[PDB]
Amino acid sequence: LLDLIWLEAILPKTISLAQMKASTLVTNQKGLIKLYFLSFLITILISMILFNFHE
C-alpha cells in the first residue's frame, strides 16, 4: 500500500504524467503559418492591455 503504490503516486508517477501532458499540449501544433502569427497578435495585445509591458 505505502511503498509500491502510494509513495510512488504522490511524487514520481504524478509528476511524470503532468509533464507528458504539458508536452503534448505544447507540441501538438498544426504547423500553419496563419495560426502561429495569430497567437503573435494575441501575445502583443495581452502584453499591452494586461501587463503594460509598453509602460
Ligand X SMILES: CCCCCCCCCCCCCCCCCC(=O)OC[C@H](COP(=O)(O)OCCN)OC(=O)CCCCCCCCCCCCCCCCC
Which residues of this protein are in contact with ligand X, per CB under 6 A? 25-26, 43, 46-47
Interface with ligand LMT in residues 34-53 (CB under 6 A): none
Contact between 12 and ligand LMT (CB under 6 A)? yes
The C-alpha cell of 54 is what? 509598453
Contact between 23 and other proteins (CB under 8 A)? yes
Contact 43, 36 (CB under 8 A): no
First to last CA, the chain: 55
Closer of 6 and 48 to other proteins (Cβ): 6
Contact between 33 and other proteins (CB under 8 A)? no
CA-CA distance, 25 to 21, in Å (whole number)? 6
